[PDB]
Design a protein around this ligand. Sequence first.
Ligand code: HEM
Ligand code: HEM
Ligand code: HEM
Ligand SMILES: [Fe+2]
Ligand SMILES: [Fe+2]
Ligand SMILES: [Fe+2]
Ligand SMILES: [Fe+2]
Ligand SMILES: [Fe+2]
Ligand SMILES: [Fe+2]
Ligand SMILES: [Fe+2]
Ligand SMILES: [Zn+2]
Ligand SMILES: [Zn+2]
Ligand SMILES: [Zn+2]
Ligand SMILES: [Zn+2]
Ligand SMILES: [Zn+2]
Ligand SMILES: [Zn+2]
Ligand SMILES: [Zn+2]
Ligand SMILES: [Zn+2]
Ligand SMILES: [Zn+2]
Ligand SMILES: [Zn+2]
Ligand SMILES: [Zn+2]
Ligand SMILES: [Zn+2]
Ligand SMILES: [Zn+2]
Ligand SMILES: [Zn+2]
Lengths: 158, 158, 158, 158, 158, 158, 158
Amino acid sequence: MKGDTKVINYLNKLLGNELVAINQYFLHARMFKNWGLKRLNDVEYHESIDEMKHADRYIERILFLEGLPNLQDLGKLNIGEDVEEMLRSDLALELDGAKNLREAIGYADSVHDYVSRDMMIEILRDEEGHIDWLETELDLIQKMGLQNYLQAQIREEG
Amino acid sequence: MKGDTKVINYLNKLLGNELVAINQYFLHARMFKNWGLKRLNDVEYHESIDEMKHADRYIERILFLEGLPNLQDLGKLNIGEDVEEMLRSDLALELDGAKNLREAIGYADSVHDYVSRDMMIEILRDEEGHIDWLETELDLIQKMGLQNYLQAQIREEG
Amino acid sequence: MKGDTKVINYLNKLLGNELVAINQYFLHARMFKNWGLKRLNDVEYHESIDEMKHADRYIERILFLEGLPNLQDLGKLNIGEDVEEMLRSDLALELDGAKNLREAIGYADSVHDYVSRDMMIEILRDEEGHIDWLETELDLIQKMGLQNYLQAQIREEG
Amino acid sequence: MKGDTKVINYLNKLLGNELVAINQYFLHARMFKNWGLKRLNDVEYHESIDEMKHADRYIERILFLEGLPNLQDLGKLNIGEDVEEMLRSDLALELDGAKNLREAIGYADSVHDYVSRDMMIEILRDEEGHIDWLETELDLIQKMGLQNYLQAQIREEG
Amino acid sequence: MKGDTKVINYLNKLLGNELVAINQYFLHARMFKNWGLKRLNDVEYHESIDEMKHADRYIERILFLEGLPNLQDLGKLNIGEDVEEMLRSDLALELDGAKNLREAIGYADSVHDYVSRDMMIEILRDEEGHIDWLETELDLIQKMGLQNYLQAQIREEG
Amino acid sequence: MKGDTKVINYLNKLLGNELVAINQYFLHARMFKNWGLKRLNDVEYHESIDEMKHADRYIERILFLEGLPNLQDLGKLNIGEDVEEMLRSDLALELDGAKNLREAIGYADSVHDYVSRDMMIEILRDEEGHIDWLETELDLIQKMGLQNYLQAQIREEG
Amino acid sequence: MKGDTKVINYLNKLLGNELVAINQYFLHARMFKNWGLKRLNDVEYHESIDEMKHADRYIERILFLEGLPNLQDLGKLNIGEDVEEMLRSDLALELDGAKNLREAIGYADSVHDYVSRDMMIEILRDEEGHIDWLETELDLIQKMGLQNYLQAQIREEG
Ligand code: HEM
Ligand code: HEM
Ligand code: HEM
Ligand SMILES: [Fe+2]
Ligand SMILES: [Fe+2]
Ligand SMILES: [Fe+2]
Ligand SMILES: [Fe+2]
Ligand SMILES: [Fe+2]
Ligand SMILES: [Fe+2]
Ligand SMILES: [Fe+2]
Ligand SMILES: [Zn+2]
Ligand SMILES: [Zn+2]
Ligand SMILES: [Zn+2]
Ligand SMILES: [Zn+2]
Ligand SMILES: [Zn+2]
Ligand SMILES: [Zn+2]
Ligand SMILES: [Zn+2]
Ligand SMILES: [Zn+2]
Ligand SMILES: [Zn+2]
Ligand SMILES: [Zn+2]
Ligand SMILES: [Zn+2]
Ligand SMILES: [Zn+2]
Ligand SMILES: [Zn+2]
Ligand SMILES: [Zn+2]
């Protein structure tokens, strides 16, 4: 079913955000794993799978709407070298992606693509969950201090 | 444990090959799925997961060896517009990647990184399985003709 | 709870679309069944049940909003005499119904009937699934040819 | 128990036939497997195991009768390069072996080796089953055409 | 995937070794079985199945590499007439085959056929297990004497 | 089967490394256990069992190759008096042993003892896992501080 | 709890006996295993594990009593080249160790270390079980002769 061209472009831009997050979350996860921070590996890996699910939804939607998913262009990763820096980088990325989502959702409505909109609202709800987790962890670092925060990451949560 | 620098560079190059294959296999899978070619979606999606597992092994190995995994640079995807063209593109990509693997495996041996070598031989064995599947499908297209080949893809295999 | 009058009129128009689709899908299903095209019977019958579920939702919603569901007026069926013609007819009907849905969803929003809107977005998501299935089948007919396509319909899919 | 010398010679000749069939069926099976013709691999591999069971019976019988099983001499394989050619080659081989079996069974009777005869009649019954399968497949190739025949081989039968 | 020609020749030579061992182990097994030496039948039959598995791996590998498996040429069997002689003959054969394996493994490495090499190292590991079993049995014959050794073979081991 | 003499000498040297590690890991484990550091006892004890498994493989391999395993000579233990010192000592020992392994693996290849090589590559893979664990723990001590690190050891991990 | 210094020295001497027995029993076990003497491997390996358990008890006791377990010094192994010689060597070693145990048990009593004594009496009871097994086997060799004795070792006991 031929979709609106600018909806497809938005879907590809949002797909691009997901592709960056997939990689950045996955590297961050395995860095934490390497450092023995088991709990942070489990969550960040899970965040990565979440983004893969989001990318898959975009790809299938773009294809249904008869567009060409773009998996060739990869935006900038900002990896970071310590726990706080990497968590903040994930947060900045989530925030920019949520901004793009809000723009796309408004636009899909105005051209009556209510199912692309509905999909995107579900994804944004997931993103705000990701934002909440990052914000909470970053605040915990400050509240209990880094040494205590790191000790709390060495065992996986049941 | 500080690894050999050129082994790490090879691991990053091989990781780069996997990142291209992950995306190309995943798009191809969902294109087939869109077209109703259920069987080709299932296999290509599975090939994609295989490459993700390979990428994960590289990332963890690079990190152990104290290098920086590179997930920022993404080589060229060659998507293709019809079944044969997309299968051939996956094959060309596999063949180039197997070539790089052979070079890396020889080099790891000469610097005594026998566990990076061992990991890479396991991965190459998987790649040759991927090559075999692609070659077989492409030959089946020619042998039974495209119409019959397409009809054989519409139901998933048990 | 007294609903908006024009929302009720939209709900009745959309109900009318569903009543046409229920009958056209059901006849098409049993035509396919008669012809031994088991797989097409199963899917079209299922599409028919889907439309019945949609009609039921409209009826219950209209009644809640204190309107009179209209099951008396039945729009034009376009049955068709061969597989392709009947599938295209179902597609044209789905496309017109999706158009009406988009109009109604926009209008419900402007009068703040957010639950009629929410119901209608769910239904449209189902309709786009129906559209996708029809488009895919029609493309498969062209790609594998009619004889092969027909052979692929004689056994039901597990 | 000292057997008749010419019965032992017949048993060794029949053993020789089985050794050829074991190898030819096994190669043919893996050629089909390589080509993605899963169904033909399964049946030909099974035919190969059948011949191994036949060879085992001959070996044990020759030994009981106090002869020397001959596994050293291997007659001519005729492999063939395409499906029809390889199936016909298996058929020609089965037909020659059935001929030898008929001769041996007649002879065993005339020297009162009724248990060698009984074993050989069971084996011939199996061989005629193998002949029937080959003849049927070859006729199916002609009836549905090679392209359709090949498409029908790509999935294993439950 | 077109393999190296000399690797294919090595694979065919190694296949040839396996074909000899399959037959020699299988005859030896049924000779032992005839003699009531149940335990030696079970192990030698098992060794025979092992060699069949090895031959199958070679055949599939040669075919993947686009060569022609050679099951036509059968090297010399050395059957032997008593337990010690037959066990020694199996040992001499294993030793020659291990020698050929070592040569082939070195060569596959030098042309970067690391998966043929990997397969062959697995097979050699199995062969050294076969060598160990033969050497052990032969030493047991000398240590406990032949009469005691034979008595120990008449019941199968749980 | 008579092995290469220098391979046997390497196997005995590597066995010697394992015998040192068995004892040093086992004492370290029970020191941690005494101190109430349950988690460190469990892992170090497990590392000790791993080394015992490695020693067993060497012993069995040396014996197969017809050499004399040397369990008489025991190299220097470096026990250490506090957690960090003992973990570093285990690390230094692992690193020297990995060095010896790399040398032996290269040599086994050059004399075509591919199964001793294969065994040793498996063992080295295990050793690099041991190295990774030690490095990670030592870095955790510095990152969270010793007091927090010690508190994290008092309960065993599920 | 600060133990008596001479008790700790006795515990270390007894530990030293156990470390010799662990190694000698383990090598003897794998020599028997190599020779196909399955039953002797199972028992000697088990005796080895028993000594490991004894060593562990000493180590934990020494540490509790605030001494330094000595795993660095390893007394003389006497391996032996044939079954009888190796069994006698294990026996001589057990006998010397039982002698040391008797001395230590008497001394622990005189300084009121009744729990070290109690532990040591349990260990001595185990040692006398080991002595009994060795004496019995050695007498069986003489009674049934070596050839019969060896034949009786080739299958493991249920
Ligand atoms: C590029 C770096 C990536 C890495 C390292 C990676 C890694 C992984 C791993 C380890 C898994 C678990 C395998 C399993 O399902 O059992 C997984 C699952 C999955 N991946 Fe990826 N992936 C990557 C990118 C992608 C991309 C680009 C997509 C496309 C949208 C994708 C889609 C999926 C999906 C749909 C699953 C299955 C989710 C589930 O059911 O658990 N991944 N990935
Ligand atoms: C030529 C003399 C041979 C004899 C007498 C023989 C005999 C047997 C027998 C009795 C079996 C057990 C049947 C079963 O699987 O239940 C067997 C299994 C098998 N044979 Fe043969 N065989 C011979 C040669 C070969 C050859 C040349 C190949 C080709 C590589 C081969 C491949 C196999 C395989 C793959 C199995 C199944 C293994 C398993 O899963 O148990 N055999 N053979
Ligand atoms: C010298 C100091 C040693 C100590 C204190 C020690 C201690 C232990 C203990 C407590 C166990 C657990 C018992 C069980 O299996 O339930 C064990 C297991 C074992 N040990 Fe030792 N051991 C030592 C040396 C050795 C040596 C030199 C070897 C020879 C290679 C060895 C081989 C084994 C094996 C094969 C196991 C069984 C592993 C399993 O399946 O859990 N050990 N050891
Ligand atoms: Fe989630
Ligand atoms: Fe796979
Ligand atoms: Fe449905
Ligand atoms: Fe059969
Ligand atoms: Fe085996
Ligand atoms: Fe481990
Ligand atoms: Fe015991
Ligand atoms: Zn996302
Ligand atoms: Zn997110
Ligand atoms: Zn890969
Ligand atoms: Zn691949
Ligand atoms: Zn509907
Ligand atoms: Zn519909
Ligand atoms: Zn037969
Ligand atoms: Zn047959
Ligand atoms: Zn073999
Ligand atoms: Zn073998
Ligand atoms: Zn080790
Ligand atoms: Zn280690
Ligand atoms: Zn003891
Ligand atoms: Zn003892």
